[PDB]
Design a protein around this ligand. Sequence first.
Ligand code: HEM
Length: 121
Amino acid sequence: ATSQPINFQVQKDGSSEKSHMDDYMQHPGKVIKQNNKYYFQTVLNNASFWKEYKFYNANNQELATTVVNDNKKADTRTINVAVEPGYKSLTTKVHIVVPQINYNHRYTTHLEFEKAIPTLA
Ligand code: HEM
């Protein structure tokens, strides 16, 4: 396995402004290459709030996500999002539910990588 840190910023639909969703993901992220796949690995803060999350490439096909750890006490979740070299921008569609404030909303954002996903060894 080969891995390296990658900077990213979740941005509002239709804007380069920082999205509220960015505030619920740890920075930096990670790109991992393994047998023969690439993953953007990221940590969701307050994972209990993320009722649904889907990711898409710029050409609008859904990217497979997997759960690498689920940490119930810290309320975090580490996930892998299948990516390819060259990917610059992911579209995300999320369903966020915060029961204690009667909050139930759905959103679209775009997750912007600082540099395109690199080719790795
Ligand atoms: C108790 C926790 C939270 C509170 C109090 C809260 C509050 C808000 C508020 C006030 C807005 C403004 C809506 C608008 O201007 O139309 C908003 C929108 C939004 N929220 Fe949250 N939110 C919370 C949790 C989350 C979580 C966990 C996520 C996902 C990681 C999230 C992602 C978004 C997104 C994507 C928008 C639409 C505009 C944007 O991209 O920033 N929020 N929320």
